[PDB]
Amino acid sequence: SHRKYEAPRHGHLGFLPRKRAASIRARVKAFPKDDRSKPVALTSFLGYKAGMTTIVRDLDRPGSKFHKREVVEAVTVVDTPPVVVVGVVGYVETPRGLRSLTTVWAEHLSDEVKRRFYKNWYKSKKKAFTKYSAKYAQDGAGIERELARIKKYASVVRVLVHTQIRKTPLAQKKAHLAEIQLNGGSISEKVDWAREHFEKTVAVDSVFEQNEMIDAIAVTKGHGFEGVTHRWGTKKLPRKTHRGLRKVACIGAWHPAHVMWSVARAGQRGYHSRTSINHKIYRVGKGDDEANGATSFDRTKKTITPMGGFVHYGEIKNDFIMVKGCIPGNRKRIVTLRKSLYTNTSRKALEEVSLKWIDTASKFGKGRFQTPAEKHAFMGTLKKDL
Amino acid sequence: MKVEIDSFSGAKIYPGRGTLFVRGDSKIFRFQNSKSASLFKQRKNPRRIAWTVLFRKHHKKGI
Amino acid sequence: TKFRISLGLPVGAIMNCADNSGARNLYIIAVKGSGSRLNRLPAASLGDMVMATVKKGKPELRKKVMPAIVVRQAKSWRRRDGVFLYFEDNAGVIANPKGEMKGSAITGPVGKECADLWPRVASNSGVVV
RNA sequence: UUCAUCUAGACAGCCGGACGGUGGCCAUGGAAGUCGGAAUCCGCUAAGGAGUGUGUAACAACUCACCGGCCGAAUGAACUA
RNA sequence: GUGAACAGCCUCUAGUUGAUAGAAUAAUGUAGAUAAGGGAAGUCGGCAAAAUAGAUCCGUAACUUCGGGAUAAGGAUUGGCUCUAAGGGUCGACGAUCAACUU
RNA sequence: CUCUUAAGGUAGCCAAAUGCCUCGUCAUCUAAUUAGUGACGCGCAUGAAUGGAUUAACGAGAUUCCCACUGUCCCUAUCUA
RNA sequence: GCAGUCAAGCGUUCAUAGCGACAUUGCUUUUUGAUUCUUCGAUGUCGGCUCUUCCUAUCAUACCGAAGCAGAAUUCGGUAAGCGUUGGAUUGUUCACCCACUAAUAGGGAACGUGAGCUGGGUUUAGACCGUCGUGAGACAGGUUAGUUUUACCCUACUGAUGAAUGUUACCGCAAUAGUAAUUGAACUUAGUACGAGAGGAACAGUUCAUUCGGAUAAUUGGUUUUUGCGGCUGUCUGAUCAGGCAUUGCCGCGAAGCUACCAUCCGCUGGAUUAUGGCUGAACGCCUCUAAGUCAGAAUCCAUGCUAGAACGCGGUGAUUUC
RNA sequence: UGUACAACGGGGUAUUGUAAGCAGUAGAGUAGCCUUGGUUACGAUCUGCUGAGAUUAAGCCUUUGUUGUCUGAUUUGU
Ligand SMILES: [K+]
Ligand SMILES: [K+]
Ligand SMILES: [K+]
Ligand SMILES: [Mg+2]
Ligand SMILES: [Mg+2]
Ligand SMILES: [Mg+2]
Ligand SMILES: [Mg+2]
Ligand SMILES: [Mg+2]
Ligand SMILES: [Mg+2]
Ligand SMILES: [Mg+2]
Ligand SMILES: [Mg+2]
Ligand SMILES: [Mg+2]
Ligand SMILES: [Mg+2]
Ligand SMILES: [Mg+2]
Ligand SMILES: [Mg+2]
Ligand SMILES: [Mg+2]
Ligand SMILES: [Mg+2]
Ligand SMILES: [Mg+2]
Ligand SMILES: [Mg+2]
Ligand SMILES: [Mg+2]
Ligand SMILES: [Mg+2]
Ligand SMILES: [Mg+2]
Ligand SMILES: [Mg+2]
Ligand SMILES: [Mg+2]
Ligand SMILES: [Mg+2]
Ligand SMILES: [Mg+2]
Ligand SMILES: [Mg+2]
Ligand SMILES: [Mg+2]
Ligand SMILES: [Mg+2]
Ligand SMILES: [Mg+2]
Ligand SMILES: [Mg+2]
Ligand SMILES: [Mg+2]
Ligand SMILES: [Mg+2]
Ligand SMILES: [Mg+2]
Ligand SMILES: [Mg+2]
Ligand SMILES: [Mg+2]
Ligand SMILES: [Mg+2]
Ligand SMILES: [Mg+2]
Ligand SMILES: [Mg+2]
Ligand SMILES: [Mg+2]
What are the annotated disulfide bridges (chain B)? Predict the structure, then answer.
């Protein structure tokens, strides 16, 4: 007989299977459509989620109840030191999809990216790319031949870039290497851009700008094996239930005489690849710029780092991207920020946000002071110091 | 933005921090955190709570 | 016309009557504009119009369904300016379906969202937040 | 299949006419061809119904049956499986 | 010892240290807890849980077989410390000496 | 007025743990009540030691409402072994 | 139970806007019967809770056609199951009924889905009471009260998790296939405008929010406390002090981290092809004709974009490949 | 054999709420003494040193300090 009271199904069947992502770095499965009149540019960037904070800004939304008023908003900080371009990959199109024809690497690779090709770096002889670097022996004839092949072919061009994880406070020391599509015209000049940027750094400010809508692609925080109640949001069974209540009561009818794929089951929760779109960049700040956390309204010379450091992360010392709201992935996780795949014009995008104040109170507690100088001024002199 | 003052402890309240309590008589109390909020609800006197600005002022601490 | 306010007054909640209509409390039986979800109680927030009965109060006002407007919540809710605020009690005022108050005076403070949503409540209100 | 129209011009198509006796008689507050009953007529007639519709409170007025101007050979109706 | 108490809790004498262990801390469990706002809307049904609770003082309705109901209902107080007052024995209207707790 | 029995259900009580019709009718209780209570009684099929009616007190008996209380629920979360 | 055909009539006129007698053709298996084919060395017997999926005879939402469609509202109908279809009082109840919200509170199937998922209020063991019946033991689709809900560790299914084999190993990728998701409302304005004698009274475009759902996240607020972190308190033990033990986490207040809440916040894409339908040209049938050839637009539909997984017997690029 | 790693230490951050000890013409009062205005003793508590003390990664941040560690086993060939 029928369900006898309608309810929406629990969970989204389009995010199946709820299995662990095959890699800790979520793959970018779609790049922005190529407009071949614009200059050559990366379609994405690699960063490390540092943590969240809060900002105050005047809302610009005519017709809204809070128009020209002050709104407090949550923001996520992504430590984004410049990425080192170390190679180029050419992609030809086939009746069976895109296919990598050849990859041309830079002559010199840093130990950061070399560690990525090693499970046991400490006891290896570090022979990686030693014979490849010999292709630059006298004139780089083989490198030029491969680049000529990429120009003659490879309707899609991607650069291989790696993070400078040594500039982050992470203990990993092993760089993250990824392919970033080169948008802009003339595959020939895509290859020229890649070759000219071999062994060179590209900063996040050359990829992204303020008020831009971007997408965050990351593996979510893992939670291990989870019951249906929290994995799918199913109703808790009554307290009277024998054999447990954090379950689904009926996991299927008599026919089909099988548990169906659509029924909520206990299993792995979190550590899933997610691509969340339309996150507005609130700041493109620079590590070399002190007063990173300052605004035109605050003028207090302070960095983006909260007092005591970002909890479980450390201090931001590099370029950083501050996006509105929250993004998938936990602190210290590698995330990929990609340009939006469409042109959003909705007055939520295209809104020019000007931060009035960035919170730098300690996230290790109920932080009361934005700066150590402010703590000094409020508290007065102490016994130890001050 | 304007930095508020804790009605109980006198600590600086930055935007989003703590809570705001509107009493029956429409008096407004701002608490920087749940510690001061809970002490106020317990009806403790800030003049007796040794870490508050009011206590330190009444006891001539720091000045 | 108003942002989402954390619902703190589900069906069956009894709030104080803040008007001078002679009612002492309002008993929530419904929330206007509330959605549908299995087992989910209709719940009201500050500024919402509810359907209510007078549990204690004037006998002429008791034993019937009437519109009411929530003017105090007592459940902490977040304003867009980042302020988490709450009242000491849940309170509402008897009104007609068009939002005009049955009483002529408000006792105690009134939420800004409720005052902005309902001009008659704002006109009869004293302290707003 | 059966019955019809047709080079003595079939049907369709465009345009002209579509009167007089006559607001025919009666029921209706008013009904003139046309909400309704009966009578189902002729003179002019190639031709016109006391009326095929639209329209009017009733009129008036368009419209079609009917006959014509033009083109020039097949066409129409009811049936059967 | 606390406490009205052979209650509960801690300790002395005496006895035991016996229940297969080690490492991790997923789901679901069994046992024990907490929870914003609402307060039975859950459910057959307040099931389960929570709330109350000792003692002192005040106050206590209907009904009643006058015996009860009754701890009705409903209130207030309670720590520590320093004191004050009252309540005795024995011996020779008073003196000497001795003494334990309850208010 | 009749037929009629041994006598024809008296005092009481009731949609009662006894009433089919029935979720009876009225009132109250609620926003809403096949529930509860108070009434009514041509009562399928109430009723007098097969005891009737009522009763203070008592009840791990059945039931309704109210105050307090709460994770029973809204709507779940967290912690310990 | 649902749907047709005819058309005497209703509909002021007018059979077919909407209906529709007398008749008649069907469909369905969510009624109840009929039967007794399966099961009596046993398929757990009501209802609810929970959860998934399916159907469409479509309540709502999308786009439309018709009206006795002026507007508003409404009615009939088409494509359409993509998407939603509720909170409660009484009752074990299915059913019913009422209150209320809502865009709507559509109807159903899945062994009258679902008891090694629950529950056990009812029916339907044994106790007991009443009424009627019986001489009686006892009977009662009559009422009432109490009444043990057992087992999975196997196989498969499902959910997640490893993994041999391809020379080895490592990095970066491709994408067959499978899944897929967003939903609905309100306010402002349009506009007191179109329409209408008036009463009343829209819609497109735009804006701000909200509902239901989903995926994340913990800056803030709240919850959680074995941080047994700090403080306080009782009883007792360590001669007193200091500092501690025990009270099965002794209790209380605060409590960082972590986890977590529409109790918090953030985010949830745009192209093509179509259905109904409305058209273009245009014969059939010198006219007419959206249709026959051809063709335009067009739905919450479909397929893509995008999103999830990555075939462990699909593929590509690239690095290093053992002196002994 | 290092912008190495670890264990401690330091600092920052955060939590609680002012440690022990000493002292005091603080202390409701009480009991002695004699030079009769003090002194001695008991005293919940109060005040000062003292926003002190304690804890702070166990999944906080940081570190010119101190101390130490850094070749064990198995297997893999086109
Ligand atoms: K059988
Ligand atoms: K917390
Ligand atoms: K102790
Ligand atoms: Mg349904
Ligand atoms: Mg969630
Ligand atoms: Mg059980
Ligand atoms: Mg924090
Ligand atoms: Mg907190
Ligand atoms: Mg329910
Ligand atoms: Mg004693
Ligand atoms: Mg609670
Ligand atoms: Mg509470
Ligand atoms: Mg209450
Ligand atoms: Mg209920
Ligand atoms: Mg219910
Ligand atoms: Mg019930
Ligand atoms: Mg109980
Ligand atoms: Mg009593
Ligand atoms: Mg009492
Ligand atoms: Mg009688
Ligand atoms: Mg009776
Ligand atoms: Mg009765
Ligand atoms: Mg009830
Ligand atoms: Mg009897
Ligand atoms: Mg069996
Ligand atoms: Mg079976
Ligand atoms: Mg259909
Ligand atoms: Mg069944
Ligand atoms: Mg089963
Ligand atoms: Mg069972
Ligand atoms: Mg069952
Ligand atoms: Mg039972
Ligand atoms: Mg029995
Ligand atoms: Mg008998
Ligand atoms: Mg011991
Ligand atoms: Mg202890
Ligand atoms: Mg045409
Ligand atoms: Mg065609
Ligand atoms: Mg594979
Ligand atoms: Mg340290």
Answer: none
